[PDB]
């Protein structure tokens, strides 16, 4: 069970957790799994 979507013990969003506020493009780059999702998206986040 490494991951099998357990959902009350797991994680994968970003509104909830970085939105209405600020963070940062490092952690989103975990979520996202790969590079280039996560610089291509956080380019709208930022200016």
Same mark, same amino acid.
């Given at each position: +069970?490494?991951?099998?979507?357990?959902? /009350?013990?797991?994680?994968?969003?970003? /509104?909830? /957790?970085?939105?209405?506020?600020?963070?940062?493009?490092?952690?989103?780059?975990?979520?996202?799994?790969?590079?280039?999702?996560?610089?291509?998206?956080?380019?709208? +986040?930022?200016?």
């Amino acid at each position: +069970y490494n991951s099998g979507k357990l959902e /009350e013990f797991v994680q994968g969003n970003l /509104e909830r /957790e970085c939105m209405e506020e600020k963070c940062s493009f490092e952690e989103a780059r975990e979520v996202f799994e790969n590079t280039e999702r996560t610089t291509e998206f956080w380019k709208q +986040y930022v200016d």
